[PDB]
Amino acid sequence: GQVPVSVNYHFSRKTTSHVEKPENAKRGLTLLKQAGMKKINFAGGEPFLYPKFLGEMIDFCKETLQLESVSIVTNGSLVKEQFLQKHGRNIDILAVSCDSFNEATNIKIGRGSGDNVQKLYEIGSWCQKYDIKFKLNTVVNKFNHLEDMNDHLNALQPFRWKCFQVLIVTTLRNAHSLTISDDEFDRFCERHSSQTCLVPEPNRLMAKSYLILDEYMRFLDRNGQQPSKSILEVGVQQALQAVFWDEEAFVERGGIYDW
Numbered sequence: 001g002q003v004p005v006s007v008n009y010h011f012s013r014k015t016t017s018h019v020e021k022p023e024n025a026k027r028g029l030t031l032l033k034q035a036g037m038k039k040i041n042f043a044g045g046e047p048f049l050y051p052k053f054l055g056e057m058i059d060f061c062k063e064t065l066q067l068e069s070v071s072i073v074t075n076g077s078l079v080k081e082q083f084l085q086k087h088g089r090n091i092d093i094l095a096v097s098c099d100s101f102n103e104a105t106n107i108k109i110g111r112g113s114g115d116n117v118q119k120l121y122e123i124g125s126w127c128q129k130y131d132i133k134f135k136l137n138t139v140v141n142k143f144n145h146l147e148d149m150n151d152h153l154n155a156l157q158p159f160r161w162k163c164f165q166v167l168i169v170t171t172l173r174n175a176h177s178l179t180i181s182d183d184e185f186d187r188f189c190e191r192h193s194s195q196t197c198l199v200p201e202p203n204r205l206m207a208k209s210y211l212i213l214d215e216y217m218r219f220l221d222r223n224g225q226q227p228s229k230s231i232l233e234v235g236v237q238q239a240l241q242a243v244f245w246d247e248e249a250f251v252e253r254g255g256i257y258d259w
Contacts, residue, residue: 001035001236001240001241001245002035002036003035003036003037003211004036004037004209005036005037005038005039006037006038006039006040006041006069006209006211007032007039007040007041007211008040008043008210008211008212008213009040009042009043009057010044010213010214010215011025011042011045011047011053011057011215012046012049012050012215013045013214013215014044014045014046016049017045019050019053019215020215020216020217022053022056022057024217025053025057025217026057026060026064027232028213028217028230028231028232029057029060029061029065030065031231031236032213032231032236034236037067038068038069039067039068039071040061040067040069040070041071041072042054042057042058042071042072043072044073044212046074046077046078047073048074048077048078048083049078051078054072054083055083055086055087058070058072058087058090058091059087059090061090062090062091063090069092070091070092070093071091071092071093071094071095071135072093072094072095073095073096073137074094074096074097075096075111076096076097076098076116076119076123077119079123079126081122084126084127084129084130085130088131089130091130092133093132093133093135094127094132094133094135095135095136095137095162096120096123096134096135096136097137098116098120098137098138099111099139099141099144100143100144100147101116101147101152102114102144102147105144105147108143109141109143109144117152120156124156124158133159133160134156134157134158134159135162136153136156136160136161136162136197137164138161138162138163139166139254139257140163140164140166140180141178141179142178142179145180145184145185145187147188148191148192150191150194150195153192153195157197158197159197160197160199161192161198161199162199162254163188163189163192163198163199163200163201164201164252164254164255165200165201165202165203165255166178166179166180166255166257167203167256167257169223169224169256169257170259175257175259178257182202182204185200185202186202201252201254201255203255206252207251207252208248208249208250208251208252209247209250210250210251210252211245211250212224212253213231214227216230217230217231217232218231218239219231219240219242219243219245220243221243222243222244222246222249222250222251224256224258226243227243228240228242228243
């Protein structure tokens with residue numbers, strides 16, 4: 001460390017929850033830039049629950065820090081067109097997490113009830129109006145691994161469709177009651193082979209260099225836990241050693257269900 005090119009800033013957690021003051025976050029992200037950060041991704045709580053902060057920090061990252069890439073991950077429920085217009089010049093990628101187009105499937109995963117589907121189409125279209133790359137994030141699990149989505153994906157034309165094989169971390173067993181074999185996962189990917197945006201990520205080979213910065217601007221370790229002290233306190237490289245930072249061990253948590 002040097003930090004990876006990309007850092008995932010989970011600036012609030014899933015009353016309500018702690019969020020950094022804008023001056024402090026502005027300072028933390030500056031530290032990250034000086035340490036090698038070029039791309040930022042706002043996750044994981046639900047960023048559009050806090051649009052004034054999201055908007056301030058998007059502008060700051062693109063205008064002041066001149067970052068190559070500014071991404072957001074969202075369930076899409078609270079995205080309104082006024083935000084994308086006010087800030088779209090500064091947002092490169094908006095990823096919407098969508099696991100199913102069936103209301104029943106969604107309820108069973110722990111998300112519903114729908115109908116989410118028209119809102120997704122609204123967002124996809126606002127993305128082209130405001131020059132935002134439109135990405136879809138899907139976790140393939142016991143409940144959606146037989147679903148056919150080609151029609152909806154042909155309509156939505158994301159520039160990237162990332163499909164993660166579910167992985168659960170540990171009275172539960174309603175985990176192994178949710179895993180899928182690699183064959184089931186592959187049969188989902190083939191079922192959508194006609195789909196050029198499709199980027200599969202199986203458990204056998206997860207993306208590396210995946211670093212999470214939490215709502216106190218602390219890093220998490222290779223398991224999503226044992227946070228360092230905030231970079232605001234000990235700075236970037238000392239906080240990296242505090243969490244045993246190693247590019248190859250920090251796999252992507254996007255497909256993971258952290259329980």
